[PDB]
Amino acid sequence: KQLKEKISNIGVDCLGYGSNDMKELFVVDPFIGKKQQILLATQLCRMILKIDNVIISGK
């Protein structure tokens, strides 16, 4: 659907409504909040992948 139509506010309806268009379902999120999910994730995983030596001193 999203490849066909350019309207980009259709997602997964979890409450079981008959229509997936989110204009009528009253759901809104901030841009700064959804952006930080990608930024803090992709910036952390760079650090996770760059570890080769892993030394853990037993307590």
Binding site: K50, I51, D52, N53
Partner: protein, 50 residues
């Protein structure tokens, strides 16, 4: 004349003091530096690892 039954010999260095002669120790010192060197071997370069 003697004070007692026997008299054990004195160790020159203190008991537990490690010491060694020959070319074995300097090779061990070089191998010790190479052991520390191998930890930082793949770290060198832009594509290195933390």
């Amino acid at each position: 004349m003697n004070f007692g039954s026997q008299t054990p010999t004195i160790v020159v260095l203190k008991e537990g003091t490690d010491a060694s002669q020959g070319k074995g120790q300097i090779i061990s010192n070089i191998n010790a530096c190479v052991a520390v060197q191998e930890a930082l071997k793949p770290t060198l370069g832009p594509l290195g690892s933390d």
